[PDB]
Amino acid sequence: FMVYDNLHKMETVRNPRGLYWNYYYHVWQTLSVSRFANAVAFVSGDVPAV
C-alpha cells in the first residue's frame, strides 16, 4: 500500500439572511500500490493460461 493524505481541512460560512451555517470538509489524498511488492490473488473460475 502506498496511500498518503495531502489535505484535510474544514471551512465554515454563515448566512445572515437565512440564519444558517454551512460546513465544508475537504479531503485530498493519493491512492496507489507498489509493483515492487509481492501480491498474490486466489481466483476460482475460468482463468486464462497466461
Binding site: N15, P16, R17, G18, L19, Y20
Partner: protein
C-alpha cells in the same frame, strides 16, 4: 428626513440567493430659498422743518 422601513417575512430558503441584495432607505428632502427683498424710503427736509 429619513423615515421608517418595511418589515419582511423570514425565509431561510430564499435567503440563500438574496444575502447581498440591497434596499435603499426612505429619505426625503426639502429646500428653502430667499423670498423677501424690500426697503423703506423716507425724506427729511432739515431746513424746511427747522
Amino acid at each position: 428626513y429619513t423615515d421608517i422601513t418595511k418589515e419582511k417575512q423570514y425565509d431561510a430558503e430564499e435567503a440563500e440567493q438574496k444575502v447581498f441584495e440591497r434596499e435603499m432607505p426612505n429619505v426625503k428632502t426639502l429646500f428653502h430659498e430667499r423670498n423677501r427683498q424690500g426697503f423703506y424710503h423716507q425724506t427729511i427736509q432739515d431746513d424746511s422743518l427747522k
